[PDB]
Write an enzyme that holds these catalytic residues in place. Structure first.
Site, short mmCIF file in Angstrom:
data_model
loop_
_atom_site.label_atom_id
_atom_site.label_comp_id
_atom_site.label_asym_id
_atom_site.label_seq_id
_atom_site.Cartn_x
_atom_site.Cartn_y
_atom_site.Cartn_z
N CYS A 171 0.82 -1.20 0.00
CA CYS A 171 0.00 0.00 0.00
C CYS A 171 0.85 1.25 0.00
O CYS A 171 1.82 1.35 0.80
CB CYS A 171 -0.95 0.04 1.23
SG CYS A 171 -2.12 1.45 1.13
N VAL B 49 -4.35 -4.95 -1.16
CA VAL B 49 -3.30 -3.97 -0.99
C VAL B 49 -3.62 -2.79 -0.05
O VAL B 49 -3.00 -2.63 1.00
CB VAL B 49 -2.81 -3.46 -2.39
CG1 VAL B 49 -1.65 -2.43 -2.23
CG2 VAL B 49 -2.39 -4.65 -3.27
N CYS B 50 -4.54 -1.92 -0.44
CA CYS B 50 -4.87 -0.79 0.41
C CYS B 50 -6.35 -0.88 0.79
O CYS B 50 -7.06 -1.72 0.25
CB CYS B 50 -4.67 0.53 -0.37
SG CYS B 50 -2.97 1.14 -0.71
N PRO B 51 -6.82 -0.05 1.77
CA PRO B 51 -8.25 -0.08 2.14
C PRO B 51 -9.01 0.35 0.88
O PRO B 51 -8.47 1.12 0.07
CB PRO B 51 -8.36 1.06 3.18
CG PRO B 51 -6.98 1.10 3.83
CD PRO B 51 -6.08 0.90 2.62
#
Ligand SMILES: [Cl-]
Ligand SMILES: [Cl-]
Lengths: 173, 173
Positions: A171, B49-51
């Site tokens: 991320c 990966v990311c929120p």
């Protein structure tokens, strides 16, 4: 946009630009392979309401250079109108000296390939395109606001794209 | 993008959304005529990966509310997947409670009218569209980055567009 799609090669162009040193040079988007490119297409050099949006990029051209990124401006202005406006003070609606190349699209072919040509008249909207070192279009952002672009936001984006390039399963936190 | 064009009516849609209270309701973009709309189309609720980027907007939903603006999220998830993911904690790749409506586009028709459908597969890119109180498309911004959007930037943009409306011949400075 016309032929511009995220994740695909940014539409190519070969046009004449007014370089910072004053010379007219025919440049291609492919010349910048190896580094990032922030291609900002704006309507006209001459503005009445706000300062032409491309100026803020010229002013901060070095921050882009620091990030292996070349900023290239563009409008349907001819290379003579470009020069003429660069030699017109910002307070008279002009551009003033420029630190980045300004592409000329009087035939409107580039505006078309990038889908930023207005429907009724022959001038573009404000289109910002972030292209990577491999020539792949990564960001498309269009609006008709004389204050849409934020130089810090764009700088942050380029950093995010580079980070992603150098990691990818992580991320950009 | 598809049919989305700045300064023109934003493509219309009528689809089922999982509302904040939990009910399924068929909503139309025209229902919001009279106020601003921040339409954010993201790929999937489930992220690795990311929120999921829509979460930041839910969390700050009240700031958009203060600006006479409704945020509407959307993805190709069905209304059941949406509710399932809302009921999956963010730490499991889910969304957690939501304060804004989430539109379902399992038929990908909205993705298409908004030009955010990927070429090879059936999920979208991350498309943010700011639509005014008259239903006119004002901002188009697409990328495939799990951090492309900045909630502060978008709020700023909405304030700029409103200011233009209320004045125009004057620069939002
Ligand atoms: Cl401009
Ligand atoms: Cl996302």
């Amino acid at each position: 946009s016309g032929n511009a799609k995220i994740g695909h090669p940014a539409p190519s162009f070969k046009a004449t630009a007014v370089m910072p040193d004053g010379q007219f040079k025919d440049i291609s988007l492919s010349d910048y392979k190896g580094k990032y490119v922030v291609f900002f297409f704006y309507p006209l050099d001459f503005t009445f309401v706000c300062p032409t949006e491309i100026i803020a990029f010229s002013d901060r051209a070095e921050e882009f250079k620091k990030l292996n990124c070349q900023v290239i401006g563009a409008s349907v202005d001819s290379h003579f109108s470009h020069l003429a406006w660069i030699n017109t003070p910002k307070k008279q609606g002009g551009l003033g000296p420029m630190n980045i190349p300004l592409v000329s699209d009087p035939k409107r072919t580039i505006a078309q390939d990038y889908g930023v040509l207005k429907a009724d008249e022959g001038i573009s909207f404000r289109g910002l395109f972030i292209i990577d070192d491999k020539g792949i279009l990564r960001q498309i952002t269009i609006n008709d606001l004389p204050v849409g672009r934020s130089v810090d936001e764009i700088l942050r984006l380029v950093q995010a794209f580079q980070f992603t390039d150098k990691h990818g399963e992580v991320c950009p936190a």
